[PDB]
Amino acid sequence: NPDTGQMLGRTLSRWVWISLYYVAFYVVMSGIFALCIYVLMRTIDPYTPDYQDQLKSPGVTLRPDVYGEKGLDISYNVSDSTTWAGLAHTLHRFLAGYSPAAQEGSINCTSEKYFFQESFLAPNHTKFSCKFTADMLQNCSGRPDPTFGFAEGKPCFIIKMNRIVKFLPGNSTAPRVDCAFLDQPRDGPPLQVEYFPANGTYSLHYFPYYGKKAQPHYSNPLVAAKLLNVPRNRDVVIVCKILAEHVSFDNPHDPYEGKVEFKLKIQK
Amino acid sequence: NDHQLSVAELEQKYQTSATKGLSASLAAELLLRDGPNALRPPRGTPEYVKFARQLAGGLQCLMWVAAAICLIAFAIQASEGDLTTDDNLYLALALIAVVVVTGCFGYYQEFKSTNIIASFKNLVPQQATVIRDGDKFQINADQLVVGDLVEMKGGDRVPADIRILQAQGCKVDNSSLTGESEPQTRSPECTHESPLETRNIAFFSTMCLEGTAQGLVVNTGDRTIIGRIASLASGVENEKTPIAIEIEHFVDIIAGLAILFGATFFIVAMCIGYTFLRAMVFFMAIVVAYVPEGLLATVTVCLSLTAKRLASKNCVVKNLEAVETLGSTSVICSDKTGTLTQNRMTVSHLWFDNHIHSADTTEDQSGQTFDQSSETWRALCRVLTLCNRAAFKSGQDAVPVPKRIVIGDASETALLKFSELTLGNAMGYRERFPKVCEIPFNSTNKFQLSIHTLEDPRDPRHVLVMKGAPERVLERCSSILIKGQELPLDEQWREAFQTAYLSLGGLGERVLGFCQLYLSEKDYPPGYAFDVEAMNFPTSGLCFAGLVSMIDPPRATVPDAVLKCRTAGIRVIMVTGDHPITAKAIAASVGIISEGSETVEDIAARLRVPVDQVNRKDARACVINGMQLKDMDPSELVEALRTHPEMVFARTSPQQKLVIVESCQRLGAIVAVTGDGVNDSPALKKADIGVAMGIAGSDAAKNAADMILLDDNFASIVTGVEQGRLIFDNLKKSIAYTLTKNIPELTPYLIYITVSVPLPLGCITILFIELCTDIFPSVSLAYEKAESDIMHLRPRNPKRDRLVNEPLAAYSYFQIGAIQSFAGFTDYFTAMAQEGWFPLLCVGLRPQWENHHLQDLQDSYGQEWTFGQRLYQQYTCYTVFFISIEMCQIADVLIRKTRRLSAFQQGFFRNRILVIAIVFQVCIGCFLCYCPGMPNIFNFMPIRFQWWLVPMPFSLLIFVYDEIRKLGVRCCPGSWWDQELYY
Ligand SMILES: CCCCCCCC/C=C\CCCCCCCC(=O)OC[C@H](COP(=O)(O)OCC[N+](C)(C)C)OC(=O)CCCCCCC/C=C/CCCCCCCC
Ligand SMILES: CCCCCCCC/C=C\CCCCCCCC(=O)OC[C@H](COP(=O)(O)OCC[N+](C)(C)C)OC(=O)CCCCCCC/C=C\CCCCCCCC
Ligand SMILES: CCCCCCCC/C=C\CCCCCCCC(=O)O[C@H](COC(=O)CCCCCCC/C=C/CCCCCCCC)COP(=O)(O)OCC[N+](C)(C)C
Ligand SMILES: CC(C)CCC[C@@H](C)[C@H]1CC[C@H]2[C@@H]3CC=C4C[C@@H](O)CC[C@]4(C)[C@H]3CC[C@]12C
Ligand SMILES: CC(C)CCC[C@@H](C)[C@H]1CC[C@H]2[C@@H]3CC=C4C[C@@H](O)CC[C@]4(C)[C@H]3CC[C@]12C
Ligand SMILES: CNCC#CCOCc1cc(Cl)ccc1-c1ccc(Cl)cc1
Ligand SMILES: *[C@@H]1O[C@H](CO)[C@@H](O)[C@H](O)[C@H]1NC(C)=O
Ligand SMILES: *[C@@H]1O[C@H](CO)[C@@H](O)[C@H](O)[C@H]1NC(C)=O
Ligand SMILES: [Mg+2]
């Protein structure tokens, strides 16, 4: 079918015309698609999303986050510092963003109430965001313990709630972290936790989040859960739940919605 | 052979005797040397091999290869850290399931058709009369051995191939084995060289009609004439159907496009940093993507619907592919006796009152009648009614006269039926005219005589009525009856009678002469002693009533069916074993030879010149007999076929019918064969489609044929031609509709691989589109009406007009499919942007998006998402892409209704099935989107109403673009636009 005069059943002039027609067709279609995308992006609001259909309840993440086969798995040896050196380094890297120099774009907040802002009073047409420094975690801030309690077998875990634009957890009381054994071992007592800040609360003045354009310096408030009575040389499962009026943790299809669960083994 | 070989030289080969026969021990030993005198059954085809055949096929094999490639890809992705590979298993299972269920459907169709055809198949044990060592006992037919002495009488079946030694008025029915419509005399003398033409050979499967005969068995079982025809049919190979060829061509197009696309994106994946295994997996993914899973089901359903429509007209196909062949047929080779004609002798013409009249020969009496108001007609009718001995079987009031069963020979049966149709109550009239003397028909005088008395009590004469050969009657009959007169023979009546006789003879009709005489009451008083041996009555000086001629006439619908076939551009050739004169007369009667068409012999007779000095190119018609065909080489046969458009083959053997079919097929034509007898079975098998008469058809013919006309209605051929052309066009439309949606199902995967956006469309939703939502709309296009006078078009050129061609493929894939892809991606980006993911952030996001270890990934607003939330957003993207495809497919099915006409011209809602299919598609889409549990069962999401509206302008654009394209084709008939944009 290839030839000299008619290549694949078409003269060279005919190929030119049909190819030009297809080029014009695809140019017109691409222009229509580009116009549709431009119109969409001009209808989009730059501060608030149109819908939050998949964001009814915030996710919960934990640091240090080491994943095994299915989910978070943290195992180390109190005798061997090499086992928890990486975990401590991860925590230090994470708290570098909560250093006071990193918190320069935020302000001190003391209201302990929803920080509602209807105007852009902060510099460069921005809304204010509240400060959160590592020192509010105290014993789990990395000072005076750079190992975050891992050397002594009382590790610190930092719990963070996923931020959602204009989400309100509930203002009767501050949202609070509660960590417990998923299945309490019958050879020991229930889990004993000391929280930082005290009682493991996220202050209400960190809410609502107004988005990245309105609050470029926003920082998620943190809660540190220092586990005090983890049995040695045994595999335990720990679940840290968020207790708030508008936060649900009962989703069979999202094990990170409103809570975080991890496996922990501390060897000696 | 044995026929040109005297009884002296016989009885030595066969070690028999004409008087005694064979010894019992010799017969029993020959019965052990050879087998029983029976035909071998057509052997084979176990019930699972048919199912395996249904599982085989071009589209089926493409799907088998696609499933195997899916399995290989699953194995390769399990041999590494790819995983998440349930999609390959789902798709392979879907492919295999579609193939298997479609094969089950096809097998059921063939099984049901086989049962329908066998429901009209009977079975009977056959016995024979044999004379061995002087004892004339009865015996089973298959007990016979070669050289046996056999006796047969009227009404029996001939028990084997027999060389006649004695015969007394023996006639046989050879219409099934040969093409001979008229009963054939069997005599104990050699009359022709060939055994098929001599009078001293009677054949195995035929029926003795009247008289008695004695003969020697010369062939037995599979070595008889019918056994050799069955052997010849067994050696004929059945070719692929035209629709199978078209499907294979379309599969080749699909495979080539898949290979090109997959290779190009394999290279792209290599160049953008993928590994060899990853790129190979992508290439095989694309190749499998180009295979449409539901198209096999759509095609099978459309063919079954056409088959059901044909069966509504008593036309039963043995396989679904046969419903298309008549649409593509360009040559019909038709048998004459029993197929074009009724295979029944009936009164056709009469000669009385110096005029030639025409009678109604149709089996339903729907034709025109002659003038039945004349004293000459009354006398002729009385003569032909009284000089008859046939009788209708008792209790035949419901069955019409042409189909009533009669105890008598063919000529007397035809005369009796003609009497019943014209006068009415022929037997009542006969018994009202009592008979007092009768000389039956015999060869010494070659006529039949009878004497009757008048009905009225006031008339003492005795009426003489005579029937016989026209010349024997004319040697008598000093007078003639013309319009209430008794004109003496003035030699002008003699020349007129001779002219009429040769005219009716040249029309290929058997002619009989009728006459009467009124005996005086004085010379022949009442109660007269009429003595058959004294010959006292006058057998001369009679009065001639008229001539009556008979022919085996065409079936009623045949002439109009032939005219319609030739209007549709189909060439009709007659291939018959009958005699050339009868064949030519019937061909003229049915329209195979047109009015004014002439053969070289006709031209020579008109121009008073020898035939060798006649230009062949001036003869539109041609009649070739078997002896001339034997001497012809294939080049001469091709030359004759191309020279003469109106062709008749007469005295044609089954092998020569096969040769003619093969020559026509070699010239490039799709050939249909219509036949009924055993002599047609090899040609029927060789034909691209074989059509057999349901009622007249022999078992060999019905087994060889692809299509059976259960009511013997020849107009079903015209119905089949129209339905085949319609199904060809509608399959074109349905295939275009099905192919269009493959591009919007593939492009999201290509964008996913190359740009790394989150997956816009899933395997499960693709399966739902292919197998659930679109199959009913695709099938509904089989109910579209023709866009033109489809019966006035020529047959399509098989090598040029393909079912699926380059314009159809290009249009469907890369214009409409491209628009659908753009609609889907517009909806995808709208759904992402309105939920927080801007288009530029979507680019390259796939690794983070699919990372199970990232549970706080940030969107365009800084919100942090878990993996499960991102997965539900991905399911929303699946759903919006699915709905975009569905909305565009509504417009696609609307624009697919016509290829040239406007939707406004053809009618938006004339196809109620299509309207229902659209409503049903929308309902299933809504159910999938909004039934609870769908997100976790099939990953469909309850999408917002504005995602439904986003693709609607794209669907409207599809409709408007197709409407403008088809207006360009109608306004500019042969422009560049018609050449490139029409399909
Ligand atoms: C054989 C020929 C094939 C041709 C295929 C199509 C070619 C063209 C495709 C892409 C080129 C660009 C098209 C888009 C043009 C966008 C028009 C525009 O001006 O928009 C502006 C946006 C940026 O606005 P912003 O977000 O900053 O505004 C924020 C507003 N505030 C601040 C208020 C929130 O720019 C953008 O989004 C740009 C986003 C473009 C990239 C999207 C991902 C690419 C995916 C393409 C798949 C298409 C497949 C088509 C089907 C093929 C069938 C064969
Ligand atoms: C074209 C018309 C076809 C009609 C076919 C016959 C009708 C069958 C349809 C429905 C009958 C059963 C209806 C369901 C039972 C009553 C409703 C109910 O009790 O709801 C309870 C929950 C609601 O779930 P949700 O709204 O929270 O969803 C999850 C949302 N997410 C994304 C947010 C987390 O249900 C669950 O939890 C999951 C419970 C199991 C899922 C529902 C059971 C029925 C679904 C599938 C059965 C087979 C259907 C497929 C057949 C082949 C394909 C056509
Ligand atoms: C051709 C003949 C058609 C006859 C009618 C077809 C069947 C209609 C029957 C039922 C559909 C309506 C009821 C279910 C929807 C509400 C359930 C719900 O709740 O939807 C909710 C909102 O609903 C809506 O925005 C509107 C719903 C209806 C939209 C349009 C429906 C389709 C209509 C098509 C007509 C097209 C006609 C033109 C083309 C065809 C021409 C012939 C969705 O939930 P969400 O996104 O807030 O959840 C977010 C949380 N997440 C995602 C995790 C679960
Ligand atoms: C630059 C982009 C938009 C494409 C180029 C412009 C398009 C819309 C126009 C400009 C020139 C046009 C071509 C001019 C000549 C011919 C020859 C004719 O026999 C077929 C149409 C065809 C092939 C036209 C197709 C459409 C065309 C290519
Ligand atoms: C749209 C993008 C992919 C075009 C990229 C350039 C190449 C691949 C394009 C440019 C012009 C095109 C051709 C234009 C016209 C025809 C004639 C048609 O009967 C077969 C395909 C065919 C449709 C196209 C094949 C692909 C093609 C050669
Ligand atoms: C009409 N075309 C449809 C399509 C497509 C493109 O890739 C196929 C595809 C898509 C998706 Cl989402 C998931 C898996 C596959 C897929 C991958 C490998 C094989 Cl061997 C077969 C199929
Ligand atoms: C926390 O720190 C204070 C002083 O720095 C100390 O008294 C207290 O014991 C610490 N708690 C734990 C659990 O180490
Ligand atoms: C690690 O823990 C195990 C307890 O299972 C202990 O036996 C071992 O000594 C520890 N490693 C080192 C380096 O001590
Ligand atoms: Mg016949």
Residues B733-771: b if buried by 16+ CB within 10 A, e if exposed: bbbbbbbbbbbbbbbbbbbebeebbbbbbbbbbbbbbbe
Which atom of ligand 7 lies at the shortest distance from residue A154's CA?
Answer: 13
Report how far ligand 5's centroid is from the alpha carbon of B982 (Å). 16
Report how far ligand 7's centroid is from the alpha carbon of A109 (Å). 26
Q: Is A160 on the interface with B (CB under 8 A)?
A: yes
Question: CA–CA distance from B422 to each of A78, B152, B400, B404 (Å)?
Answer: 122, 36, 14, 15
Collect all residues with Cβ–Cβ distance below 8 Å to A229 and sequence separation of at least 6: A188, A189, A191, A192
Do residues B664 and B640 touch, judged by C-beta distance below 8 A?
A: no
B356 forms bridges with which residues in the sheet?
B351
Report how far ligand 9's centroid is from the alpha carbon of B651 (Å). 12
- Chain A residues within an 8 Å CB radius of B835: 49-54
- Chain B residues within an 8 Å CB radius of A47: 861
- Listed in order, the ranges of chain B carrying CATH 3.40.1110.10 are 346-550
Collect all residues with Cβ–Cβ distance below 8 Å to A71 and sequence separation of at least 6: A255, A261, A262, A263
Nearest CA in chain A to B851: A67
The ligand 4 site (C-beta within 6 Å) comprises: A 17, 20-21, 23-24, 27; B 976
CA contacts within 13 A on the Cβ side of A119: 1
| Class for the domain spanning B735-981 | mainly alpha
Which mutation among A139, A143, A192 tests ligand 7's pocket best, with the greatest number of atoms within 8 A of CB? A139
Residue B833 and residue A253: Cβ atoms within 8 Å? Answer: no
Range list of β-strands (E), B676-716: 689-693, 707-709
Compute CA B833 distance to the chain's CA centroid, rounded to the nearest angstrom. 61
Pick among B838, B863, B952 to test the A interface (most A CBs inside 10 A): B863
Element (H, E) at B150: strand B149-153
Residue B862 and residue A53: Cβ atoms within 8 Å? Answer: no
Cα–Cα distance for residue pair B411/B391, rounded to 1 Å? 13
Q: Strands A176-181 and A235-243, how do they pair?
A: antiparallel
- State the sign of the Cα–Cα–Cα–Cα dihedral A23, A29, A31, A33: negative
Judge residue A144's burial from the number of C-beta atoms within 10 Å of its C-beta, 0-12 exposed, 13-18 middle, 19 or more buried. exposed
Tell me the two tokens of residue B305: 């619907």
Question: CA–CA distance from B760 to each of A195, B751, B818, B842, B881 (Å)?
Answer: 43, 9, 16, 11, 7
* CA distance, residue B177 to nearest chain A CA (Å): 49
* CA distance, residue B254 to nearest chain A CA (Å): 17
Tell me the two tokens of residue B144: 């016979």
Tell me which method was used to determine the 3D structure: cryo-EM
Tell me the two tokens of residue B361: 């020969």
- State the sign of the Cα–Cα–Cα–Cα dihedral B621, B626, B631, B634: positive
- Chain A residues within an 8 Å CB radius of B856: 59, 61, 160, 162
Nearest CA in chain B to A30: B822
Cα–Cα distance for residue pair B252/B258, rounded to 1 Å? 10
Residue B819 and residue A29: Cβ atoms within 8 Å? Answer: yes
The three-class DSSP label of residue B604 is: helix
CA contacts within 13 A on the Cβ side of B242: 32
Phi then psi for residue B575, to 5 deg, are -125, 110
List B residues 806-825 in contact with A (Cβ-Cβ < 8 A): 806, 814-815, 818-819, 822, 825
- Listed in order, the ranges of chain B carrying CATH 1.20.1110.10 are 735-981
Do residues A177 and A220 touch, judged by C-beta distance below 8 A?
A: no
- State the sign of the Cα–Cα–Cα–Cα dihedral B608, B611, B615, B619: positive
| Residue B208 DSSP symbol | E
The three-class DSSP label of residue B982 is: coil
Architecture of domain B346-550: 3-Layer(aba) Sandwich (3.40)
Angle value at C-alpha B345, between B341 and B350, nearest 5 degrees: 110
Cα–Cα distance for residue pair B973/B430, rounded to 1 Å? 71
- Per the annotation, the verdict on B335 as an active-site residue is yes
Residue B864 and residue A218: Cβ atoms within 8 Å? Answer: no
Q: Is B798 on the interface with A (CB under 8 A)?
A: no
Do residues B819 and B958 touch, judged by C-beta distance below 8 A?
A: yes
- Listed in order, the ranges of chain B carrying CATH 2.70.150.10 are 125-234
List A residues 11-50 in contact with B (Cβ-Cβ < 8 A): 17-18, 21-22, 25-26, 29, 32-33, 36-37, 40-41, 44, 47-50
The three-class DSSP label of residue B621 is: strand
Q: What is the DSSP string of B495-521?
A: HHHHHHHHHHHHTT-EEEEEEEEEE-T
Tell me the two tokens of residue B768: 């739902």
Report how far ligand 9's centroid is from the alpha carbon of B351 (Å). 30
Q: How many CB atoms lie within 10 A of CB B841?
A: 15
B172 forms bridges with which residues in the sheet?
B184, B208
* CA distance, residue B889 to nearest chain A CA (Å): 18
Residue B834 and residue A48: Cβ atoms within 8 Å? Answer: no
Pick among A14, A21, A53, A222 to test the B interface (most B CBs inside 10 A): A53
* CA distance, residue A40 to nearest chain B CA (Å): 7
Residue whose Cα lies nearest atom 1 of ligand 7: it is A139
Cis peptide bond N-terminal to A144, omega within 30: yes
Collect all residues with Cβ–Cβ distance below 8 Å to B468 and sequence separation of at least 6: B441, B445, B446, B447, B448, B512, B513
Cα–Cα distance for residue pair A194/A177, rounded to 1 Å? 11
Do residues B573 and B599 touch, judged by C-beta distance below 8 A?
A: no
Residue whose Cα lies nearest atom 11 of ligand 1: it is A34
Cα–Cα distance for residue pair B558/B560, rounded to 1 Å? 6
Judge residue B151's burial from the number of C-beta atoms within 10 Å of its C-beta, 0-12 exposed, 13-18 middle, 19 or more buried. middle
CATH code for the part of the protein at B125-234: 2.70.150.10
Tell me the two tokens of residue B369: 């009648």
Do residues B808 and B736 touch, judged by C-beta distance below 8 A?
A: yes
Element (H, E) at B832: helix B817-834
Cα–Cα distance for residue pair B300/B504, rounded to 1 Å? 53
Report how far ligand 6's centroid is from the alpha carbon of B738 (Å). 17
Of the listed ligands, the closest to the CA of B938 is 2
- Chain A residues within an 8 Å CB radius of B957: 32
Residue holding tokens 């299933």? Answer: B924
Q: Is A218 on the interface with B (CB under 8 A)?
A: yes
Cα–Cα distance for residue pair B459/B453, rounded to 1 Å? 8
Pick among B826, B869, B981 to test the A interface (most A CBs inside 10 A): B869
The topology under which CATH files domain B315-341+555-712 is Rossmann fold (3.40.50)
- Listed in order, the ranges of chain B carrying CATH 3.40.50.1000 are 315-341+555-712
Q: What is the DSSP string of B554-566?
A: BPTTHHHHHHHHH
Q: Which of A9, A163, A256 sits opposite B855 (nearest CB)?
A: A256
Collect all residues with Cβ–Cβ distance below 8 Å to B157 and sequence separation of at least 6: B126, B141, B205, B206, B207, B208
Angle value at C-alpha B416, between B414 and B418, nearest 5 degrees: 70
**DSSP-H helix ranges across B37-136:** 47-55, 58-78, 86-119
Residue A41 and residue B861: Cβ atoms within 8 Å? Answer: no
Cα–Cα distance for residue pair A84/A150, rounded to 1 Å? 7
**DSSP-H helix ranges across B79-198:** 86-119
Report how far ligand 2's centroid is from the alpha carbon of B928 (Å). 9
Cα–Cα distance for residue pair A249/A177, rounded to 1 Å? 12
Collect all residues with Cβ–Cβ distance below 8 Å to B818 and sequence separation of at least 6: A25, A26, A29, B743
Spatial CA neighbour of B702 closest among B710, B712, B711, B692:
B692
- Chain A residues within an 8 Å CB radius of B869: 54-55, 59, 254, 257
Element (H, E) at B464: strand B462-468
Q: Strands B510-519 and B543-551, how do they pair?
A: antiparallel
List B residues 842-901 in contact with A (Cβ-Cβ < 8 A): 852-853, 855-856, 858-870, 872-873, 876
B650 forms bridges with which residues in the sheet?
B625
Element (H, E) at B544: strand B543-551
Instruction: Determine whether the shortest distance from the Cβ of A19 to ligand 5 is under 6 A.
Output: yes
Which atom of ligand 1 lies at the shortest distance from residue A40's CA?
Answer: 20
* CA distance, residue A114 to nearest chain B CA (Å): 19
Q: How many CB atoms lie within 10 A of CB A189?
A: 10
Instruction: Determine whether the shortest distance from the Cβ of B945 to ligand 3 is under 6 A.
Output: yes
CA contacts within 13 A on the Cβ side of B730: 30
Phi then psi for residue B785, to 5 deg, are -80, 165
Report how far ligand 9's centroid is from the alpha carbon of B325 (Å). 22
Options B335, B680, B688, B774, the catalytic residue: B335
Cα–Cα distance for residue pair B100/B103, rounded to 1 Å? 5
Q: Which of B818, B833, B976 sits opposite A40 (nearest CB)?
A: B833
Tell me the two tokens of residue B66: 């696609």
Phi-psi region of A112 (alpha: psi -120 to 50; beta: other; left: phi over 0): left
Compute CA B755 distance to the chain's CA centroid, rounded to the nearest angstrom. 56
Pick among A14, A36, A206 to test the B interface (most B CBs inside 10 A): A36
Nearest CA in chain B to A72: B853
Residue A29 and residue B818: Cβ atoms within 8 Å? Answer: yes
Question: CA–CA distance from B127 to each of B158, B221, B810 (Å)?
Answer: 10, 14, 68
The three-class DSSP label of residue B47 is: helix
Q: Any idea how long chain B is?
A: 983
Cα–Cα distance for residue pair B783/B729, rounded to 1 Å? 11
Cα–Cα distance for residue pair B778/B533, rounded to 1 Å? 84
Of the listed ligands, the closest to the CA of A7 is 5
Question: CA–CA distance from B420 to each of B375, B382, B463 (Å)?
Answer: 19, 12, 21
Cα–Cα distance for residue pair B633/B842, rounded to 1 Å? 75
A193 forms bridges with which residues in the sheet?
A227
Can you give B298-355 as a three-state secondary structure string? HHHHHHHHHHHHHHCCCEEECCHHHHCHHHHCCEEEECHHHHHECCCCEEEEEEECCE
End-to-end Cα separation, chain A, in angstroms: 78
Residue holding tokens 């890297």? Answer: A93
Cα–Cα distance for residue pair B628/B613, rounded to 1 Å? 19
Residue holding tokens 């999202």? Answer: A254
